Design an enzyme around this catalytic site. Structure first.
Site, mmCIF file in Angstrom:
data_model
loop_
_atom_site.group_PDB
_atom_site.id
_atom_site.type_symbol
_atom_site.label_atom_id
_atom_site.label_comp_id
_atom_site.label_asym_id
_atom_site.label_seq_id
_atom_site.Cartn_x
_atom_site.Cartn_y
_atom_site.Cartn_z
ATOM 1 N N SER A 145 0.850 -1.209 0.000
ATOM 2 C CA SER A 145 0.000 0.000 0.000
ATOM 3 C C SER A 145 0.878 1.250 0.000
ATOM 4 C CB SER A 145 -1.025 -0.092 1.125
ATOM 5 O OG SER A 145 -1.984 0.941 0.937
ATOM 6 N N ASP A 242 -8.706 -3.004 -6.630
ATOM 7 C CA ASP A 242 -8.173 -2.686 -5.311
ATOM 8 C C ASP A 242 -9.186 -1.890 -4.474
ATOM 9 O OD1 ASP A 242 -5.425 -2.494 -3.680
ATOM 10 O OD2 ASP A 242 -6.462 -0.562 -3.611
ATOM 11 N N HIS A 288 -7.177 -5.989 -0.882
ATOM 12 C CA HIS A 288 -6.154 -4.964 -0.686
ATOM 13 C C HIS A 288 -5.017 -5.569 0.130
ATOM 14 C CE1 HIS A 288 -4.438 -0.965 -0.342
ATOM 15 N NE2 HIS A 288 -4.509 -0.998 0.976
HETATM 16 N N1 LIG Z 1 -0.918 5.402 0.568
HETATM 17 C C1 LIG Z 1 -1.994 5.141 0.740
HETATM 18 C C2 LIG Z 1 -3.460 4.816 0.968
HETATM 19 N N2 LIG Z 1 -4.326 5.295 -0.188
HETATM 20 C C3 LIG Z 1 -4.041 4.512 -1.355
HETATM 21 C C4 LIG Z 1 -4.961 4.933 -2.509
HETATM 22 N N3 LIG Z 1 -4.837 6.383 -2.853
HETATM 23 C C5 LIG Z 1 -5.274 6.918 -4.161
HETATM 24 C C6 LIG Z 1 -5.797 6.063 -5.139
HETATM 25 C C7 LIG Z 1 -6.214 6.560 -6.370
HETATM 26 C C8 LIG Z 1 -6.105 7.925 -6.623
HETATM 27 C C9 LIG Z 1 -5.589 8.780 -5.644
HETATM 28 CL CL1 LIG Z 1 -5.450 10.546 -5.963
HETATM 29 C C10 LIG Z 1 -5.177 8.275 -4.416
HETATM 30 C C11 LIG Z 1 -4.968 7.194 -1.590
HETATM 31 C C12 LIG Z 1 -4.111 6.670 -0.436
#
Ligand SMILES: N#CC[NH+]1CCN(c2cccc(Cl)c2)CC1
Ligand SMILES: *[C@@H]1O[C@H](CO)[C@@H](O)[C@H](O)[C@H]1NC(C)=O
Length: 342
Positions: A145, A242, A288
């Site tokens: 992650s 995800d 995830h």
């Molecule tokens: N590190 C971390 C945890 N999250 C993963 C997914 N993140 C995400 C996914 C798609 C588009 C944008 Cl702008 C952000 C946010 C933060």
């Protein structure tokens, strides 16, 4: 059990100024080293970081850390649980910088918090060289992650650090799990990353920074844009659906036509971005993270498990008959792969 060591250099710190550290379990019969970056979101301004400090303090401070940790999944030392690298030297690096492992800023009279993720990784590598990393043949930088994105931001810097320190025989590679995200249109954000980078003094890899240039470094937090600029070998693990991606997209699972098309398009797009990634594992599942889960051996793509795909990857870095390295589902809906976690 991996045992905690706080960094000897006490100026490399977690958010609140307490020393950062790592958990270690050595295997002196092995020349392989696995350094795992923990995940757990991030914070991007004072009020948002103050909230995190009240209810997620272990992700901001070492004051309450336990002295031992159990290795699980790819960090387990049992062949049963970890067919891939059970005999390796194992390192777990806790995430206490809230900066997606990108920061290089100290706490001062003008900074309530320190954001030192990129410097924590460098200092851990330095202190490990005195405990046997000097004899390694392979250093695998892995993470899940926020830690998976951190692998992408830091793998080439670790390689350069080791070259400059006089260790050219150590092969540096990366394993990015559940850190490959799309800056897509939501079903019903990018500004947080952009503000965070200024807040953390965040650093991105040099070739990617030179492409996007000043003010646009936020682009390098997205796998399909930063990966083509990397020189070290990187294996990419990503669920096609995800759960963190879908949360950001405001999707919460009787699906009608609009949401059906949306979800199918997301799978196709993620799938398109991996087509020229030769070492990858991407099942059509709603989930995830995976690599430090105990049952990470269960899921298969085209009849090949993730531990097998990583072993085939090792062999390729010495196509292979019966031992594939690029594994991406083609079916278009969550859990059309029967081996998805239930
Ligand atoms: N590190 C971390 C945890 N999250 C993963 C997914 N993140 C995400 C996914 C798609 C588009 C944008 Cl702008 C952000 C946010 C933060
Ligand atoms: C400790 O880490 C800081 C931050 O990276 C660095 O400025 C300093 O040189 C380090 N100290 C030693 C003795 O290596």
């Amino acid at each position: 059990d991996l045992r905690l060591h706080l960094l000897l250099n006490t100026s490399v710190t977690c958010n609140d100024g307490s020393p950062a550290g790592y958990y270690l379990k050595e295997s002196r019969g092995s020349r392989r080293w696995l350094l795992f970056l923990e995940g757990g979101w991030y914070c991007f301004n004072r009020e948002n970081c103050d909230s995190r400090y009240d209810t997620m303090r272990r992700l901001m401070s070492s004051r309450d850390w336990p002295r031992t940790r159990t290795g699980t999944g790819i960090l387990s030392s049992q062949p049963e649980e970890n067919p891939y690298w059970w005999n390796a030297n194992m390192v777990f690096i806790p995430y206490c910088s809230s900066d997606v492992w990108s920061g290089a800023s100290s706490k001062s009279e003008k900074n309530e918090y320190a954001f030192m993720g990129a410097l924590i990784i460098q200092e851990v590598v330095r202190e490990l060289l005195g405990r046997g990393l000097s004899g390694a043949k392979v250093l695998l930088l892995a993470g899940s992650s926020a830690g998976g994105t951190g692998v992408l931001l830091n793998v080439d810097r670790v390689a350069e650090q080791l070259e400059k320190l006089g260790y050219p025989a150590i092969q540096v590679r990366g394993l990015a799990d559940s850190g490959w995200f799309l800056d897509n249109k939501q079903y019903r954000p990018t500004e947080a990353i952009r503000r965070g980078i200024r807040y953390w003094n965040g650093v991105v890899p040099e070739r990617c920074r030179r492409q996007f240039q000043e003010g646009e470094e936020w682009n390098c937090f997205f796998g399909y844009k930063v990966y083509p600029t990397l020189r070290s070998p990187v294996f990419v693990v990503q669920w096609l659906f995800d759960e963190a991606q879908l949360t950001v997209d405001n999707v919460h699972l009787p699906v009608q036509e609009g949401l059906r098309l949306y979800i199918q398009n997301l799978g196709r797009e993620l799938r398109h971005t991996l087509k020229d990634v030769p070492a990858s594992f991407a099942p059509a599942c709603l989930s995830h993270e995976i690599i430090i889960r105990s049952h990470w051996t269960d899921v298969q793509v085209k009849g090949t498990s993730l531990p097998r795909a990583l072993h085939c990857w090792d062999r390729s870095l010495h196509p292979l008959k019966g031992c594939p390295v690029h594994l991406v589902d083609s079916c278009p809906w969550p859990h059309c792969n029967p081996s998805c976690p239930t």
